[PDB]
Amino acid sequence: ETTSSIGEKVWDDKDNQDGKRPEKVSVNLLANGEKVKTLDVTSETNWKYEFKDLPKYDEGKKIEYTVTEDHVKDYTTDINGTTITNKYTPGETSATVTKNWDDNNNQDGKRPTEIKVELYQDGKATGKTAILNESNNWTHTWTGLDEKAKGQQVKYTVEELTKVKGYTTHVDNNDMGNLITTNKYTP
Amino acid sequence: ETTSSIGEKVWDDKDNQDGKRPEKVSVNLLANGEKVKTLDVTSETNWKYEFKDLPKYDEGKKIEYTVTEDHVKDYTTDINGTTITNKYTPGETSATVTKNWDDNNNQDGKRPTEIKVELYQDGKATGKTAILNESNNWTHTWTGLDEKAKGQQVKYTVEELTKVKGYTTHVDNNDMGNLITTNKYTP
Numbered sequence: 014e015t016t017s018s019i020g021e022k023v024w025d026d027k028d029n030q031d032g033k034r035p036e037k038v039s040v041n042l043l044a045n046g047e048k049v050k051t052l053d054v055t056s057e058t059n060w061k062y063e064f065k066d067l068p069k070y071d072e073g074k075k076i077e078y079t080v081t082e083d084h085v086k087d088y089t090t091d092i093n094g095t096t097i098t099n100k101y102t103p104g105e106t107s108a109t110v111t112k113n114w115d116d117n118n119n120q121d122g123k124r125p126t127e128i129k130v131e132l133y134q135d136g137k138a139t140g141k142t143a144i145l146n147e148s149n150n151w152t153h154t155w156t157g158l159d160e161k162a163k164g165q166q167v168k169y170t171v172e173e174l175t176k177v178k179g180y181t182t183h184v185d186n187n188d189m190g191n192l193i194t195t196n197k198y199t200p
Numbered sequence: 201e202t203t204s205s206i207g208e209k210v211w212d213d214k215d216n217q218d219g220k221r222p223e224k225v226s227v228n229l230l231a232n233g234e235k236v237k238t239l240d241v242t243s244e245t246n247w248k249y250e251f252k253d254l255p256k257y258d259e260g261k262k263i264e265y266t267v268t269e270d271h272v273k274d275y276t277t278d279i280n281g282t283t284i285t286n287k288y289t290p291g292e293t294s295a296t297v298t299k300n301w302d303d304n305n306n307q308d309g310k311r312p313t314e315i316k317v318e319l320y321q322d323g324k325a326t327g328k329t330a331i332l333n334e335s336n337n338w339t340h341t342w343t344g345l346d347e348k349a350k351g352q353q354v355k356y357t358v359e360e361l362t363k364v365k366g367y368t369t370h371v372d373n374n375d376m377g378n379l380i381t382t383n384k385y386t387p
Contacts, residue, residue: 103327103328104327104329159326161326163321163322
């Protein structure tokens with residue numbers, strides 16, 4: 014019926030010795046790969062957060078909840094089921110990608126068991142690939158990405174490599190911390 | 201009265217399966233952050249070297265000897281004591297910087313205790329800073345650095361961000377594998 018997703022953010026930055034830690038981060042809640050809510054997490058909340066009263070099932074099926082964090086400058090993000098860790102990595106950062114299936118559940122069970130996506134840097138393929146499926150809640154996070162390239166901020170985006178007959182593909186690349194790929198079923 | 205440094209060159213490239221291993225490597229001997237001797241190491245010596253007959257003390261202190269390696273295309277260098285490990289990484293390498301204090305073993309007690317340096321890509325700030333101090337031996341190695349940009353080799357340099365009162369700074373940026381920042385005490 015109803016559940017809740019509680020968690021916290023932990024900073025791994027040598028007790029902010031460099032003084033680069035921000036006053037807040039924004040956590041996104043995803044229901045089956047779709048961003049439905051956001052919350053700003055701060056010290057005032059003690060770096061804790063919780064999404065109250067949420068349905069457990071979506072028309073019988075069990076909704077799969079996950080969380081992502083909007084990109085934080087100079088921090089590499091590691092998400093461990095609700096516990097979000099930000100490691101200070103000056104000049105470097107991470108990127109997270111989730112797959113969103115828009116096909117009214119698998120009605121017309123034509124949904125592939127897995128898909129392959131690739132990370133792109135300023136339009137160039139990086140070679141960094143990921144295979145999204147149920148074993149990883151259709152999510153994956155890459156680390157070790159440069160934030161700059163000869164003084165200019167590098168833009169990261171993802172593209173689906175798998176050709177899914179029947180599905181149209183659209184990608185939201187507005188935040189490297191919450192890159193979302195949605196496949197829409199259109200016979 | 202006399203001392204000597206020995207060590208070995210270790211290759212991590214599936215026994216040169218891609219045939220990119222160079223015929224030799226230049227190992228540098230640093231006496232308290234100052235380059236005092238070089239040595240071309242080959243398989244003729246079994247990738248082992250030795251800087252025999254070295255003064256054990258100099259102007260009041262037991263000299264802190266360290267080794268660095270001249271940049272080798274497509275390999276990422278890792279120094280652990282006198283053991284230099286080179287890993288095969290197509291398209292990227294590492295950069296090593298060492299702080300050289302020239303203040304008569306800090307006789308006047310004006311030495312900082314800590315300084316911050318930053319890696320530059322073709323004269324542009326990368327954001328990748330590092331803090332040098334007595335704990336890490338005033339040395340640091342960055343990895344995952346692209347050797348090329350737009351088809352052209354990239355020039356890597358280091359800049360000292362920390363302003364050191366009473367000191368004048370000079371940087372030797374000739375080889376990214378042996379970047380050396382020198383601070384001379386000029387009251």
